Design a protein around this ligand. Structure first.
Ligand SMILES: CN(O)C(=O)CC[C@H](C[C@H](N)C(=O)O)C(=O)O
Ligand SMILES: CN(O)C(=O)CC[C@H](C[C@H](N)C(=O)O)C(=O)O
Ligand SMILES: [Li+]
Ligand SMILES: [Li+]
Lengths: 263, 263
């Protein structure tokens, strides 16, 4: 049949996708800005399609409920045919790869530790061996699921600590995790993806830092429904943009070029 | 039909695949050791196949001749049906992705600079702005092709320099590049993948170092013929091994655990 506008699902998460300050004076895709908005434009230009940016209804990335077997988040929107492509900081994981297609990664990351400056922690092992400095994750997403599933001794110990710690060490949003680090006088550390950690380190009031090595190594990928014809072209576009240096240019644009914490 | 032994193509390159010192007393897959030998065993165990390690006949990774349009190297062995899978430090590139299937990356790398300790170079830009310290690449492979194709100003300038430099700055093997760095009294820098650079930095006589940031960011993938049914299982195996921490364990084993240059 005739070409149709491609429905893109994404999520509001700075600096990936944000509503522009003047969004009420704008329409359609022009309401949004950020790394993933720019990436979507480049992918569409290379693949030759028109598209519509939509925001995932349930605000989730993608997991399958053990009881109902239903996929939520952006993964669910692809699985159930509500969107054609997801362009977002969506981690490539085994269980997601079983149900949707992913491009090769467009950005690398690992789980990492965010501390308030001056907190005496240098590694995951350091955290795991103590309780005075509380630590936790989001209550949803691949970072939480990493800990919940891990059989690596240090990480399994961290998960057991997080489940049993009081008061709750879990947060609902990135903003809440960052605020908790900033307001807890060195007594809370937040486990999050290194990409986000690096972004926040360059935001005022410049009081956080990423410490130690990353806990794992993985990537974000562009996702499509399993078997979608769109997958091949989008993957080739990611590879081309990477080779051209354009993915690095976009990370620099949104993370560092207008960093607020000096040069 | 009945299951058949899977033909794996790979290449002799330390520390990925090496003939064991006592190889003449051994047979079959047991003749070989290294990171990729261990990785092959893990992939086969997860996917449930038997396999035979074979060494690529022409000693190349994979490129298409502009005149004959024939693919060489491990990519060629897959394209022409001489092997079922390639398990090697084979860089995922756009032009290769067009003709074979790749897993998600099992190892990250970027092009990097190897110097003899004490050489006054800290970046690609530094190299590009001078000629007293000669610099070059292998005469075959993705690093060479990166420079040949780049439209990034610094890298295009480096390529023009390399093509016109005398005596020739190209080398035929990794061993020749490393020897040239070691023997040139600080007057040769070798451009190579960061993985290899990091390996050599931990080998006696401990006189090289990796300097500056990487020039690009990419990955090695397990390759199969386009459309091969084996691709799905192998990709899921890579993702599982990564999540379990086993890829990092294997890199540590072959790069650092028996490093020769201290702790
Ligand atoms: C960058 N961004 O995505 C965030 O920080 C949000 C929380 C991520 C989601 C994760 N990428 C997923 O795909 O599940 C996490 O689980 O850490
Ligand atoms: C690790 N190993 O692979 C080497 O050092 C050999 C040379 C690599 C080959 C490259 N991975 C390819 O896939 O073409 C290079 O072009 O730098
Ligand atoms: Li998939
Ligand atoms: Li491919």
């Amino acid at each position: 049949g005739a070409n149709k506008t491609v429905v893109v699902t994404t999520i509001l998460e700075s600096p990936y996708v944000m509503m522009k300050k003047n969004h009420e004076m704008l329409e359609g895709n022009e309401r949004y800005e950020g790394y993933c908005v720019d990436l979507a434009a480049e992918i569409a230009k290379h693949c030759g399609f028109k598209y519509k940016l939509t925001i995932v209804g349930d605000g989730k990335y993608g997991a399958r409920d053990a009881d109902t077997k239903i996929w939520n988040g952006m993964v669910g929107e692809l699985v159930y045919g509500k969107a054609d492509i997801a362009i977002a900081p969506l981690t490539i994981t085994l269980v997601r790869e079983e149900v949707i297609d992913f491009s090769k990664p467009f950005m690398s990351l690992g789980i990492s530790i965010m501390i308030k400056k001056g907190t005496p922690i240098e590694s995951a092992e350091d955290l795991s061996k103590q309780t005075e400095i509380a630590y936790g994750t989001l209550d949803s997403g691949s970072t939480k699921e990493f800990f919940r599933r891990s059989k690596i001794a240090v990480f399994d110990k961290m998960w057991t600590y997080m489940r049993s710690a009081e008061p709750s060490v879990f947060v609902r949003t990135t903003a809440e995790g960052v605020a908790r680090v900033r307001k807890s006088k060195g007594k809370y550390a937040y486990l999050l993806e290194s990409t986000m950690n690096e972004y926040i380190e360059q935001r005022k009031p410049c009081d956080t830092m990423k410490v130690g090595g990353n806990l794992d190594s993985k990537g974000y990928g562009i996702a499509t429904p399993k078997g979608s014809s769109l997958g091949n072209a989008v993957n080739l576009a990611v590879l081309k943009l990477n080779e051209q240096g354009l993915l690095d240019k976009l990370k620099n644009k949104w993370w560092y070029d207008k960093g607020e914490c000096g040069s």
